[PDB]
Symmetry: C2
Subunit: 458 residues, 2 copies
């Protein structure tokens, strides 16, 4: 009865996916040619390993493709991913084939190649598109440091950083709720590298990252009633004319004043040609003389998107020191995203982290829980679906205030069809509600699953 | 109208294929990510290049996939070859999609993956399987040094070496022809003392000549039979190297020959010992004098060195011949090296690039595309030409071979007329759409054969 998932590729994405999925209700097999890496994973987690080339029939067979419920293709190459989905489909009829695709040349023919059945991938996960769209999303919500997405698209969290003199600091959460009885509440707080469970007694301090629940169509409204929506950004500076930076420039250049700095001379000329309303410089990312010549002191958002984490961090730190109001950096790993952001560096984004979020939108734990895009050390936000009527459930027909939750766990909101309800103690759960929670420690996710399990499961 | 061929991959096979395919009537485009190799090839041959990843849609469009007559996928990986064929099929409807596939794991499922239409590769080229079958082919033609086919397997060519006391030495070709009066064959090429010579009626065969016979594949074995080659079959075979080729070959030979196999890796040798129930399997070095002596290397009929290292193959073959193995054969990666290696102490050298190229040429020739290939040791260049046009639109159609002015050093071996194979005579009259298989001593006249056969307006 546990769902069977095969993950092809033991890289950072494949391994982190396995970490978030393994449990009594999801059985994991991971495939790679690096035996040292497989051994490490099998020590950490309860899963099966197969050493071999991910798209070979014998390797897929040994990994259990004939009986698997999902295949996740996150190997080194787009072509091995596509081959593996094809071979698995043809020889084993494996359902739910999902692939990471990095090459924009394939993504330009999405419909013709991947929706027609020519290459039989059910879902494509395109890291560079996800990162570009995510940065654009932050830019449209001036003042926001993070927007949290769920499988259930209609609800979001938005985070703002509390500051000396700001409208949030020094207030208890219970008092917050009485000053403004807004369609929001605090879903989570992070303070000095630690998650903080929101309580009535919780007092917001300077430098807290405070996450607010909001319907996805209501983000501006909430930020505005919180007094935390800023005026639109105007001057954007991008460092790195690679795929992400060039695509971002194109999308921003008509409404913002964009400047872009590319280190490679040949690339810089091509982009100068191609980006008609962006001013392109050939120069180094962390050149003081250039940044002052280009009025870095007036930049609203400095966005460092090179291939090198170090260059991005150092150029953003410099940009911040020189008076850019906000800085954002591309970093490879999500473990590092926790470490880098929240101080001098306003926003850190990982293509790997974005890929994992998208993958988690397509796979549920126990058919109940989707893990959201907020995952920081042990803490994360999730949503859970409440299946069954009151006689087939432990939570349907109960009030939020009577539900006994695991430690460090809070319910922030409920999605009921189309409606987003902010949770209160008297809120009664209804059949097929999606319940949004924050957990300080994800080891209690299995306890959420068990709680929401309907009778027919037993 | 030019035939448009896309070669995906500027590796050794792609570059060689480009050479076999030079001609006025062939417009070649090569795709690869290595700019320097593309410039190299573009300097050397008249062809177009595209710098990019071979399975990308835009790259395929830039190479002319929407209009190509053939797509040859010989990149670095199986997975790129399979993706390129699918992409070209779906977006550009490109015909004649031919792919190299090295993994036995895909080839074990060809029917399900490829022939079903799921992965739209029209023809798989499996180098390891082709090398194994080629070696087997030589073993089943004892005395043969090369076996080639032409015209969708209707014509065959076999090289033998004339020896004192045998039926060839001291006779003229005109005489030999008539000592096999019912069996139609002719000498296509001869290699004598380091050089090709033109076979003529008056040519007298000498000891140590390599002599190439051409005949219908339906009769070629009766040719070998008349040449007394089948009177002493091989009996004792020793293989060195238990990789995919060596292990497949031992499996195929072990019930009809007495086979010993030497594999260096202990784990693999244990596996093979179990798997190959009629082969004697040793774990040892390929070039160990002591082992070879214990195992009677001096009574070995054919010693076949199939390791994954060329220098080991060469060294072990040289040592075996020195120690008295009657014939030795070596696997060599690089095609150019093959002829350097063979013809003295090493009787035959085989490469997977060569086998891959021969397979590709069967498809090229079937599609009526201008083509040349070199025989063993440069004995001749081999061309299959098509006689396009009627008598007013051709320089050859309706004329007798005897009245065609062929360039120097040229021998017409066979004509293929629908299903009929005719071993050519001066009296044979060429007909429209005949395939003519010919042999040239000097490759400089290859362009002249193309000009002789091209249809009007003769250019
Ligand atoms: Cl295991
Ligand atoms: Cl504040
Ligand atoms: Cl909004
Ligand atoms: Cl990535
Ligand atoms: Cl993550
Ligand atoms: Cl549902
Ligand atoms: Cl060109
Ligand atoms: Cl299919
Ligand atoms: Cl003879
Ligand atoms: Cl003759
Ligand atoms: Cl002579
Ligand atoms: Cl025999
Ligand atoms: Cl020699
Ligand atoms: Cl005509």
């Amino acid at each position: 009865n546990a769902m069977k998932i095969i993950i092809l590729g033991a890289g950072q994405v494949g391994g982190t996916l396995a970490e978030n999925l393994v449990g009594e209700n999801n059985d994991i097999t991971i495939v790679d040619k690096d035996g040292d890496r497989l051994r490490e994973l099998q020590d950490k987690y309860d899963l099966r390993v197969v050493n071999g080339h991910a798209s070979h029939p014998d390797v897929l067979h040994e990994a259990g493709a004939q009986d698997a419920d999902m295949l996740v293709a996150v190997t080194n190459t787009d072509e091995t991913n596509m081959a593996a989905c094809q071979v698995a489909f043809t020889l084993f009829n494996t359902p739910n084939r999902i692939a990471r695709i990095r090459s924009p040349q394939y993504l330009a023919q999405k419909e013709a190649l991947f929706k027609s059945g020519a290459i039989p991938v059910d879902h494509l996960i395109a890291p560079e598109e996800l990162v570009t769209s995510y940065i654009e999303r932050l830019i449209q919500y001036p003042g926001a440091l993070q927007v949290v997405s769920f499988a259930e698209e209609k609800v979001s969290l938005v985070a703002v950083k509390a500051y000396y003199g700001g409208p949030l600091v020094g207030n208890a959460l219970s008092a917050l709720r009485e000053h403004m009885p807004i369609d929001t509440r605090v879903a989570a707080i992070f303070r000095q590298g630690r998650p903080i469970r929101p309580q009535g007694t919780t007092i917001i301090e300077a430098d807290d990252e405070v996450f607010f629940v909001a319907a996805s169509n209501h983000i501006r409204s909430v930020m505005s009633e919180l007094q935390r929506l800023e005026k639109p950004y105007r001057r954007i500076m991008i460092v790195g004319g690679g795929n992400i930076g060039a695509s971002l420039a194109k999308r921003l250049e008509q409404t913002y004043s964009v400047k872009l700095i590319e280190r490679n001379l040949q690339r810089a000329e091509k982009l100068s040609e191609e980006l008609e309303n962006t001013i392109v410089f050939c120069g180094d990312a962390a050149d003081q003389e250039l940044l002052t010549e280009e009025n870095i002191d007036q930049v609203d958002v400095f966005i460092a998107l090179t291939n090198e984490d170090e260059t991005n961090i150092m150029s953003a730190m410099l940009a911040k020191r020189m008076g850019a109001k906000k800085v954002m950096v591309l970093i490879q790993r999500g473990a590092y995203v926790d470490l880098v952001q929240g101080g001098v560096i306003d926003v850190a984004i990982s293509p790997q982290q974005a890929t994992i979020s998208a993958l988690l939108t397509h796979v549920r734990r126990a058919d109940i829980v989707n893990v959201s895009s907020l995952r920081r050390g042990a803490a994360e936000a999730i949503e859970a679906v409440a299946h069954g009527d009151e006689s087939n459930s432990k939570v349907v027909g109960r009030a939020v205030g009577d539900i006994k939750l695991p430690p460090g766990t809070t319910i922030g909101a409920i999605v009921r069809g189309e409606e987003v309800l902010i949770a209160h103690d008297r809120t009664v759960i209804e059949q097929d509600d999606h319940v949004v929670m924050f957990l300080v420690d994800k080891k209690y996710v299995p306890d959420v699953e068990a709680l929401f399990q309907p009778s027919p499961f037993f």
